[PDB]
C-alpha cells in the first residue's frame, strides 16, 4: 500500500481519489492520502471551494515514483510532484502517518469497482494521450480540448485521443462507400484495431480513460471520444465475441458508477438508443442494457 503525502492544504478544496472524494477546510491539518492500492492507475483530483470552475487532477501509478502534492500559490493550484530522494520521502511519509494526519483510501474488500473501471488503463498509454514527458504523472482538467476538437488551439495542452471520424477517407474504402458507412467493421477491425491500437486492450483502455476524464473532470471532448468508440463497435456487424462480452462488462460498470445527477450531460441520448436498440450489437450488451433501462429509462 502506497501514499500521496501533501505538504499542506492552504485552500479549501474538495479532493477526489479515484471514485472517492472528501472535503478539506482551508488550512486544515491535512497531509495526504495513505493505503492506496498498488497495482492500479489512480487519479487524484481537485475542486476548489471558491471556484468550482476547473476540476483538475493527476493520473499516476505509484509503482512509477514517489509522488507528493503541494499547493503552488503563484499558479493557484494543488500540483503533483516527484521526490527522487527515496530515503527522504519514506521519513516524511512516516512522520505524517505516525501523527495520523492522512486519510486512508477507503476500499471495501468486496468492491472491484476501481478495477472494473481501469482494467485496460495503463499509465504508459495515458502519457501518450497527455503529452508532458518530463513528469511521470499526467495532468488533466475540464477545459482541455482534444486533438480532434483543435481540427474543427494550444497543441501542448491537448488530449491526443485517437481521431475517429465515420465520414473520413480513413473510415471509408473507395468502392465500399455504402458498405463501410453502414457496417463499420472495416474501420473497427482493420484500421483501428489491427492498424492503430494493435489490440482490443489498448482500445478499451483509451475508451475507459476517455470515460473517466469525462466523469471526473466534465471534459466534453473525452465524452465525445468515449461515445465514439462505443458507437464504432456497436455499428460494426463483425466484432470478436470476446470484445463484445468485455465491452458489456466495461460500460455496465461505467453506467453504475456514473453520478445519477450527471447523466443529462455525460450520456448522449442518440448514441445510446442507437447502440442498445438499433445497432448490429443491440442484442449483445445485456448487462449494459439492463442497467441503463433500470437506472436511466428516461434517456430511452
Amino acid at each position: 500500500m502506497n501514499t500521496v503525502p501533501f505538504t499542506s492544504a492552504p485552500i479549501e478544496v474538495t479532493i477526489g481519489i479515484d471514485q472517492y472524494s472528501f472535503n478539506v477546510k482551508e488550512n486544515q491539518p491535512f497531509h495526504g492520502i495513505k493505503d492506496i492500492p498498488i497495482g492500479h492507475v489512480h487519479v487524484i483530483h481537485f475542486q476548489h471551494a471558491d471556484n468550482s470552475s476547473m476540476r483538475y487532477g493527476y493520473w499516476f501509478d505509484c509503482r512509477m515514483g514517489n509522488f507528493y502534492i503541494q499547493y503552488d500559490p503563484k499558479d493557484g493550484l494543488y500540483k503533483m510532484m516527484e521526490e527522487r530522494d527515496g530515503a527522504k520521502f519514506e521519513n516524511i511519509v512516516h512522520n505524517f502517518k505516525e501523527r495520523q494526519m492522512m486519510v486512508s483510501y477507503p476500499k471495501i474488500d468486496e468492491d472491484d469497482t476501481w478495477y472494473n473501471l481501469t482494467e485496460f488503463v495503463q499509465m504508459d498509454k495515458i502519457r501518450k494521450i497527455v503529452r508532458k514527458d518530463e513528469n511521470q504523472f499526467s495532468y488533466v482538467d475540464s477545459s482541455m480540448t482534444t486533438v480532434q476538437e483543435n481540427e474543427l488551439s494550444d497543441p501542448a495542452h491537448s488530449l491526443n485521443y485517437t481521431v475517429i471520424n465515420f465520414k473520413s477517407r480513413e473510415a471509408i474504402r473507395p468502392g465500399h462507400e455504402m458498405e463501410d458507412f453502414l457496417d463499420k467493421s472495416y474501420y473497427l477491425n482493420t484500421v483501428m484495431l489491427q492498424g492503430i491500437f494493435k489490440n482490443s486492450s489498448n482500445y478499451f483502455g483509451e475508451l475507459q480513460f476517455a470515460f473517466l476524464n469525462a466523469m471526473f473532470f466534465g471534459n466534453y471532448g473525452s465524452s465525445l471520444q468515449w461515445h465514439a468508440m462505443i458507437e464504432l463497435i456497436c455499428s460494426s456487424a463483425t466484432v470478436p465475441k470476446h470484445m463484445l462480452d468485455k465491452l458489456d462488462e466495461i460500460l455496465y460498470y461505467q453506467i453504475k458508477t456514473l453520478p445519477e445527477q450527471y447523466s443529462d450531460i455525460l450520456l448522449n441520448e442518440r448514441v445510446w438508443n442507437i447502440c442498445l436498440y438499433s445497432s448490429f450489437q443491440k442484442n449483445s450488451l445485456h448487462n449494459t442494457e439492463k442497467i441503463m433501462e433500470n437506472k436511466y429509462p428516461e434517456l430511452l
Binding site: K167, S168, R169, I172, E177, M178, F181
Partner: protein
Amino acid sequence: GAMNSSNYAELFNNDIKLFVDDTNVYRVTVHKTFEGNVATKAINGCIFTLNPKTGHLFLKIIHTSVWAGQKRLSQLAKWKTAEEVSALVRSLPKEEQPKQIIVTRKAMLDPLEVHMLDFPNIAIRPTELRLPFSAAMSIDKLSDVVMKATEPQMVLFNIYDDWLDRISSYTAFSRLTLLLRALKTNEESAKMILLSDPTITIKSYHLWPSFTDEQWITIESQMRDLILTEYGRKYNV
C-alpha cells in the same frame, strides 16, 4: 447550410451548382401475386440532376437491372444516386465541377457526403424548398427516354429549351417550377393546358412548346389558376 426562401437568389449567381433529386431513381408498380400476396415490379428510373443557372439536365437513367439480386432497395437507391452523381463530378473537367450540390431530400446528405469525401471543397447542402422535380417524369420526352432504356444510360437535356435567350435564369427557373408544380398537382389538366393549341409545337430539340412571350404569360397564368384550383378542390375552399 440549408437552402431556403431567403438565399433564393444564390441559385443564379456564377458559382457552379447542381440540384440532385432522387425521387424517381427507385420506381415500382405494386401488384397481386397468383397466391394473392403482394409484390413489386420495378421500372426504370432516372436521377434528376440540374444546373439551375444554365438549365443543363444530366438525366442518369437507372435501368431496372441495377436492382437485380439486391436487398433494401430504397436505401440502396440513395447510395446508387450518390455514386452516380459522384461519377458525374469526376468525369467533368475541374473548371466544370460544381462548387455546391443541393439535394432535394435530406436522406441523400450522408450518401453523397460519403461518396464525395474526395471533393472536400464541394458543399453538399439540403434545402427547405418543396421543389416539384419529382414531376420530371411527367415530361413526355424525358419519361420516354427512361422507359425505352435497355441499359444504363446518361442523357443530356436543356430543361429550359431556349428560354435563356429571352429571360433570365431566375425567371426560367421560376417558370420551370411552376410548370412542374402544375404537372405534379393535376397532371392531366396541366398537360391539357400545354397542348390545347395544336399550332404551338415542341421543336424536336426541346421539351416544351415554342410559346411566344405573350403566350407564356397566358400559359403561366393558367398554371397558377390550376394550382390554386386543385388547392381548393383539395381543401374545399
